[PDB]
Design a protein around this ligand. Sequence first.
Ligand SMILES: *[C@@H]1O[C@H](CO)[C@@H](O[C@@H]2O[C@H](CO)[C@@H](O[C@@H]3O[C@H](CO[C@H]4O[C@H](CO)[C@@H](O)[C@H](O)[C@@H]4O)[C@@H](O)[C@H](O[C@H]4O[C@H](CO)[C@@H](O)[C@H](O)[C@@H]4O[C@H]4O[C@H](CO)[C@@H](O)[C@H](O)[C@@H]4O)[C@@H]3O)[C@H](O)[C@H]2NC(C)=O)[C@H](O)[C@H]1NC(C)=O
Ligand SMILES: *[C@@H]1O[C@H](CO[C@@H]2O[C@@H](C)[C@@H](O)[C@@H](O)[C@@H]2O)[C@@H](O[C@@H]2O[C@H](CO)[C@@H](O)[C@H](O)[C@H]2NC(C)=O)[C@H](O)[C@H]1NC(C)=O
Ligand SMILES: *[C@@H]1O[C@H](CO)[C@@H](O[C@@H]2O[C@H](CO)[C@@H](O)[C@H](O)[C@H]2NC(C)=O)[C@H](O)[C@H]1NC(C)=O
Ligand SMILES: *[C@@H]1O[C@H](CO)[C@@H](O[C@@H]2O[C@H](CO)[C@@H](O)[C@H](O)[C@H]2NC(C)=O)[C@H](O)[C@H]1NC(C)=O
Ligand SMILES: *[C@@H]1O[C@H](CO)[C@@H](O[C@@H]2O[C@H](CO)[C@@H](O)[C@H](O)[C@H]2NC(C)=O)[C@H](O)[C@H]1NC(C)=O
Ligand SMILES: *[C@@H]1O[C@H](CO)[C@@H](O[C@@H]2O[C@H](CO)[C@@H](O)[C@H](O)[C@H]2NC(C)=O)[C@H](O)[C@H]1NC(C)=O
Ligand SMILES: *[C@@H]1O[C@H](CO)[C@@H](O[C@@H]2O[C@H](CO)[C@@H](O)[C@H](O)[C@H]2NC(C)=O)[C@H](O)[C@H]1NC(C)=O
Ligand SMILES: *[C@@H]1O[C@H](CO)[C@@H](O[C@@H]2O[C@H](CO)[C@@H](O)[C@H](O)[C@H]2NC(C)=O)[C@H](O)[C@H]1NC(C)=O
Ligand SMILES: *[C@@H]1O[C@H](CO)[C@@H](O)[C@H](O)[C@H]1NC(C)=O
Ligand SMILES: *[C@@H]1O[C@H](CO)[C@@H](O)[C@H](O)[C@H]1NC(C)=O
Ligand SMILES: *[C@@H]1O[C@H](CO)[C@@H](O)[C@H](O)[C@H]1NC(C)=O
Ligand SMILES: *[C@@H]1O[C@H](CO)[C@@H](O)[C@H](O)[C@H]1NC(C)=O
Ligand SMILES: *[C@@H]1O[C@H](CO)[C@@H](O)[C@H](O)[C@H]1NC(C)=O
Ligand SMILES: *[C@@H]1O[C@H](CO)[C@@H](O)[C@H](O)[C@H]1NC(C)=O
Ligand SMILES: *[C@@H]1O[C@H](CO)[C@@H](O)[C@H](O)[C@H]1NC(C)=O
Ligand SMILES: *[C@@H]1O[C@H](CO)[C@@H](O)[C@H](O)[C@H]1NC(C)=O
Ligand SMILES: *[C@@H]1O[C@H](CO)[C@@H](O)[C@H](O)[C@H]1NC(C)=O
Ligand SMILES: *[C@@H]1O[C@H](CO)[C@@H](O)[C@H](O)[C@H]1NC(C)=O
Ligand SMILES: *[C@@H]1O[C@H](CO)[C@@H](O)[C@H](O)[C@H]1NC(C)=O
Ligand SMILES: *[C@@H]1O[C@H](CO)[C@@H](O)[C@H](O)[C@H]1NC(C)=O
Ligand SMILES: *[C@@H]1O[C@H](CO)[C@@H](O)[C@H](O)[C@H]1NC(C)=O
Ligand SMILES: *[C@@H]1O[C@H](CO)[C@@H](O)[C@H](O)[C@H]1NC(C)=O
Ligand SMILES: *[C@@H]1O[C@H](CO)[C@@H](O)[C@H](O)[C@H]1NC(C)=O
Ligand SMILES: *[C@@H]1O[C@H](CO)[C@@H](O)[C@H](O)[C@H]1NC(C)=O
Lengths: 441, 53, 43, 132
Amino acid sequence: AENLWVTVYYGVPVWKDAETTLFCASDAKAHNVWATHCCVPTDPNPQEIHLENVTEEFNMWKNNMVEQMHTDIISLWDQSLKPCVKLTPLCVTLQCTNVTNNITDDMRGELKNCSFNMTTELRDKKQKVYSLFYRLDVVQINNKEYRLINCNTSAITQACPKVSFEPIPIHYCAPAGFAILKCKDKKFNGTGPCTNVSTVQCTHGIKPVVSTQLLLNGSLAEEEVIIRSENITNNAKNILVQLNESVQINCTRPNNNTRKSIRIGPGQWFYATGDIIGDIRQAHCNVSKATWNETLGKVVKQLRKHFGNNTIIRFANSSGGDLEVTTHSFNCGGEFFYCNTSGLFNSTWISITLPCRIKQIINMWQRIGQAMYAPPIQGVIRCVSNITGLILTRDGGSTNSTTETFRPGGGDMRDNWRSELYKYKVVKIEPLGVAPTRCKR
Amino acid sequence: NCTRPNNNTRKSIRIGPGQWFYATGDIIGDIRQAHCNVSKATWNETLGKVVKQ
Amino acid sequence: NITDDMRGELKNCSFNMTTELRDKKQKVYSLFYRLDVVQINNK
Amino acid sequence: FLGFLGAAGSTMGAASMTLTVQARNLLSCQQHLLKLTVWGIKQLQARVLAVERYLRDQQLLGIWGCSGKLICCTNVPWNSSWSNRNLSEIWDNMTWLQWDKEISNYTQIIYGLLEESQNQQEKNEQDLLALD
Ligand SMILES: *[C@@H]1O[C@H](CO)[C@@H](O[C@@H]2O[C@H](CO)[C@@H](O[C@@H]3O[C@H](CO[C@H]4O[C@H](CO)[C@@H](O)[C@H](O)[C@@H]4O)[C@@H](O)[C@H](O[C@H]4O[C@H](CO)[C@@H](O)[C@H](O)[C@@H]4O[C@H]4O[C@H](CO)[C@@H](O)[C@H](O)[C@@H]4O)[C@@H]3O)[C@H](O)[C@H]2NC(C)=O)[C@H](O)[C@H]1NC(C)=O
Ligand SMILES: *[C@@H]1O[C@H](CO[C@@H]2O[C@@H](C)[C@@H](O)[C@@H](O)[C@@H]2O)[C@@H](O[C@@H]2O[C@H](CO)[C@@H](O)[C@H](O)[C@H]2NC(C)=O)[C@H](O)[C@H]1NC(C)=O
Ligand SMILES: *[C@@H]1O[C@H](CO)[C@@H](O[C@@H]2O[C@H](CO)[C@@H](O)[C@H](O)[C@H]2NC(C)=O)[C@H](O)[C@H]1NC(C)=O
Ligand SMILES: *[C@@H]1O[C@H](CO)[C@@H](O[C@@H]2O[C@H](CO)[C@@H](O)[C@H](O)[C@H]2NC(C)=O)[C@H](O)[C@H]1NC(C)=O
Ligand SMILES: *[C@@H]1O[C@H](CO)[C@@H](O[C@@H]2O[C@H](CO)[C@@H](O)[C@H](O)[C@H]2NC(C)=O)[C@H](O)[C@H]1NC(C)=O
Ligand SMILES: *[C@@H]1O[C@H](CO)[C@@H](O[C@@H]2O[C@H](CO)[C@@H](O)[C@H](O)[C@H]2NC(C)=O)[C@H](O)[C@H]1NC(C)=O
Ligand SMILES: *[C@@H]1O[C@H](CO)[C@@H](O[C@@H]2O[C@H](CO)[C@@H](O)[C@H](O)[C@H]2NC(C)=O)[C@H](O)[C@H]1NC(C)=O
Ligand SMILES: *[C@@H]1O[C@H](CO)[C@@H](O[C@@H]2O[C@H](CO)[C@@H](O)[C@H](O)[C@H]2NC(C)=O)[C@H](O)[C@H]1NC(C)=O
Ligand SMILES: *[C@@H]1O[C@H](CO)[C@@H](O)[C@H](O)[C@H]1NC(C)=O
Ligand SMILES: *[C@@H]1O[C@H](CO)[C@@H](O)[C@H](O)[C@H]1NC(C)=O
Ligand SMILES: *[C@@H]1O[C@H](CO)[C@@H](O)[C@H](O)[C@H]1NC(C)=O
Ligand SMILES: *[C@@H]1O[C@H](CO)[C@@H](O)[C@H](O)[C@H]1NC(C)=O
Ligand SMILES: *[C@@H]1O[C@H](CO)[C@@H](O)[C@H](O)[C@H]1NC(C)=O
Ligand SMILES: *[C@@H]1O[C@H](CO)[C@@H](O)[C@H](O)[C@H]1NC(C)=O
Ligand SMILES: *[C@@H]1O[C@H](CO)[C@@H](O)[C@H](O)[C@H]1NC(C)=O
Ligand SMILES: *[C@@H]1O[C@H](CO)[C@@H](O)[C@H](O)[C@H]1NC(C)=O
Ligand SMILES: *[C@@H]1O[C@H](CO)[C@@H](O)[C@H](O)[C@H]1NC(C)=O
Ligand SMILES: *[C@@H]1O[C@H](CO)[C@@H](O)[C@H](O)[C@H]1NC(C)=O
Ligand SMILES: *[C@@H]1O[C@H](CO)[C@@H](O)[C@H](O)[C@H]1NC(C)=O
Ligand SMILES: *[C@@H]1O[C@H](CO)[C@@H](O)[C@H](O)[C@H]1NC(C)=O
Ligand SMILES: *[C@@H]1O[C@H](CO)[C@@H](O)[C@H](O)[C@H]1NC(C)=O
Ligand SMILES: *[C@@H]1O[C@H](CO)[C@@H](O)[C@H](O)[C@H]1NC(C)=O
Ligand SMILES: *[C@@H]1O[C@H](CO)[C@@H](O)[C@H](O)[C@H]1NC(C)=O
Ligand SMILES: *[C@@H]1O[C@H](CO)[C@@H](O)[C@H](O)[C@H]1NC(C)=O
């Protein structure tokens, strides 16, 4: 008997979960690939709005913003290499020796001096050239004859020696008709409701840093070490540990290198690794022992919280597989390091020097079919970075509560973005609605 | 009904780095000619219908 | 093992082609149908 | 962008005062897009969609006889079966998100009725002695 009449409202504050494409924006201030694909500037003072009395459900494991970074990053890598010189002509039988001059025993057998016959700019003329190679990229044919490691598998191209891939913070912004909501609540699990939310135009700046086992240069939690997982009980899943204190790691490549330019064709140059100046030493990373053996103690108390009150926690080494899986894949200065992390996970709870290997022909994790040759860096390099989180894998689940074993794990590229896109959700705005009122035309 | 009666196999030949060429290999058993079968009993009637029209 | 109707229809051809390495060659062979193979100026 | 969603936790009645805040925000390089013609398309698709969504809502307001208005009355009675609540339970102590969840299944029934009502109104305007 209410006698009401369906009035119509437009501009109603109602939203629904949705999937759309986000666009990148930058600080303007930033030959770097992300300085060109992230041209639109963000507002210097983002218009964040607190929403009073709003409860919203989040789930970081089903967040499509993560999938978009994966696609955008691999897409750019495959565009940047588009105009550059192919190294197909270098897939020739090589003649190699052992580079034994001024070598540290740790480097014995690591470098090879290889000579070969390759063409010049003229179709009818050849030249004899030589360069140094790392053993990881050179494979013996049937003791002096060697092939490049990927000749029976993939095409090889030279990375453009002009384009920087140094991470730049980028921001993702919503398209018209959409909005991004953020959790500002505390100690968020990564899933479930949060009751302290706000509306934003764009995400905070996120650096597209890619690494394995250890997560570098991210957001450093806030109040405590937080451990997140899709399931925790299921030993097939990863555990992401976010630290509230950073651990400084110092990595270096001690050998002083030079370069030589070899004509590979008309207007096409190949960049080869030249002689090492001075002694030949092994690449490595330094982690302060005084910080690491405390950082894990914090992790253990929080890790025990999910398994038991009086149980033993053991940190073991990594398992078998490719270097991309078993080691810490670290990209720094333009070269690719594969570091041994066993020295960091060798203890039971109840200065550390890590040796590294260097690889130049990179079959990027992203796909099989094409490989990239990374030109050498002149002089020497040093890297300073922040370990901000760990990826652990549970290697137990067995019927013995006495103890449980964790190992370095991960390796999925998305594990490096999921932890930053963690606080955000994309929604669509739907402006029409109806409701009864006591008024008719 | 059409058929190709020869039992073939294939061989993969490398033509370049990451590039394969697929070549026709040996024929297993007798070598016979490909052909199609049309039922005479239907064809010589189908045309009669066409002719009237 | 040829039916007379197939006599002259197939050819066994061998040739020199490259391998994955710029400096190496291999000898291979394959069968071809006569429609796709044309005589130069008898083997 | 001074409240794009500020009224989300407000009651349905209170939130009726921000309709221009939400509406004005729903229809907000150089060489890169043409050198790499993947991104030119990705960007255009986002822009075309924002326009199409805007226009579909405007067409409905047109058909229902509510063009140019943010608040519009109709002559379709409210069915008690769509929500058995009185006005003091709807306009106060309830948000628009909650209301939308409650009504959802009846959205198409209501929209169909709004279109029928406007057509009946037009028929009555082609008879100069109408409504007497
Ligand atoms: C986590 O976050 C940290 C912090 O941001 C980050 O570490 C930083 O990494 C970057 C890149 O690896 C480092 O930047 C390099 O620093 C060296 C140091 O040079 C110093 O001394 C020279 C002396 O004249 C000064 O001019 C210079 O300003 C410094 O004081 C620079 O030399 C590097 O620049 C060269 O390489 C660039 C690569 O694109 C070129 O664009 C640039 O023009 C320079 O190259 C030129 O000189 C070369 C010399 O041989 C020549 O070969 C080239 O052709 C060209 O002419 C660069 O600035 C930065 O310092 C790091 N920060 C710290 C504290 O170490 C971590 O990497 C990050 N972790 C991740 C991502 O995992
Ligand atoms: C209010 O609506 C009911 C019908 O709504 C029913 O539930 C809806 C979700 C949807 O499934 C409808 O199709 C359903 O019918 C009206 O009752 C109907 O009236 C017609 C009139 O002839 C009758 O034929 C139907 O059988 C009736 N439905 C039922 C279930 O009895 C009711 O009249 C509406 N009231 C007003 C004021 O509009
Ligand atoms: C790699 O091999 C090359 C030769 O194939 C070495 O270069 C020679 O070094 C001797 C040293 O006195 C010179 O006299 C020759 O003229 C050099 N030859 C050429 C073609 O440059 C090179 O030193 C070796 N590199 C290493 C690291 O052992
Ligand atoms: C939601 O989280 C924010 C955290 O950013 C809270 O804001 C803080 O509130 C305290 C209260 O005294 C202030 O001192 C801080 O300065 C505020 N932070 C900022 C960045 O301004 C906010 O109060 C929380 N809201 C709710 C409902 O808990
Ligand atoms: C983690 O995943 C496991 C595996 O599915 C879940 O445990 C199983 O849940 C099903 C539900 O029907 C049961 O039938 C199985 O017996 C459970 N397995 C075991 C070993 O008990 C588990 O609940 C998930 N846990 C979390 C926290 O998500
Ligand atoms: C990382 O370094 C450790 C030691 O520095 C390597 O461990 C050695 O592995 C061999 C393999 O059987 C053992 O015989 C040695 O006793 C191990 N040393 C120690 C101290 O346990 C480990 O293999 C290295 N990892 C990689 C990937 O090279
Ligand atoms: C969030 O909820 C609180 C109460 O649950 C709202 O506060 C009320 O605001 C009305 C406005 O006139 C007051 O009359 C009430 O006395 C307030 N209640 C209390 C307990 O103080 C608050 O406004 C809500 N936020 C929004 C955005 O509506
Ligand atoms: C509106 O639709 C939802 C489903 O989209 C209805 O909820 C379902 O109702 C059936 C009835 O047997 C249940 O079996 C489902 O489990 C319900 N789904 C959920 C998510 O609860 C809802 O009842 C409909 N509302 C009206 C008023 O008809
Ligand atoms: C050449 O390198 C191999 C690598 O295992 C090593 O065993 C061999 O002794 C080296 N030859 C010389 C002369 O050092
Ligand atoms: C270059 O070709 C000549 C041809 O006889 C060969 O003797 C020589 O060893 C080749 N050089 C290399 C480094 O393979
Ligand atoms: C290429 O040759 C190496 C030689 O050991 C082999 O292990 C590898 O599987 C080969 N790759 C392919 C694609 O056949
Ligand atoms: C590492 O952590 C310290 C801690 O305050 C911070 O100041 C520094 O900027 C961090 N470095 C990076 C690369 O984030
Ligand atoms: C990090 O979390 C631990 C948890 O107990 C806390 O004791 C420690 O003080 C925190 N560190 C910082 C910098 O807040
Ligand atoms: C945190 O995630 C774990 C893993 O599924 C879950 O069991 C736990 O209930 C979650 N906590 C909250 C507050 O949702
Ligand atoms: C690591 O510590 C050792 C200790 O002597 C030092 O010699 C080495 O240079 C350090 N490496 C780095 C990258 O600082
Ligand atoms: C890294 O290098 C800086 C240079 O001053 C040094 O202060 C710091 O202690 C080094 N870190 C480690 C882990 O050795
Ligand atoms: C585990 O230890 C913590 C330490 O404060 C305690 O609060 C908690 O109740 C303990 N849990 C059990 C099951 O005893
Ligand atoms: C683990 O620690 C023990 C402690 O003495 C040490 O002997 C062993 O070599 C360590 N393992 C690794 C891989 O460093
Ligand atoms: C080093 O790690 C062991 C692991 O059990 C721990 O007992 C010891 O207290 C740690 N050192 C420091 C200074 O805490
Ligand atoms: C490499 O050695 C040359 C030799 O003079 C020197 O000038 C150059 O600075 C060195 N580069 C380093 C240590 O980065
Ligand atoms: C066509 O008919 C002949 C009659 O003997 C038969 O041998 C042949 O297999 C048939 N072909 C097909 C395709 O059925
Ligand atoms: C085609 O093959 C089917 C197989 O059963 C056969 O029944 C049919 O009669 C054949 N058609 C002709 C035209 O021979
Ligand atoms: C080779 O093929 C030709 C095709 O006409 C044929 O005339 C000739 O007799 C064939 N040679 C043999 C040995 O059958
Ligand atoms: C391959 O090249 C050699 C070079 O003398 C030649 O004798 C041989 O007949 C060629 N093979 C073929 C099948 O053409």
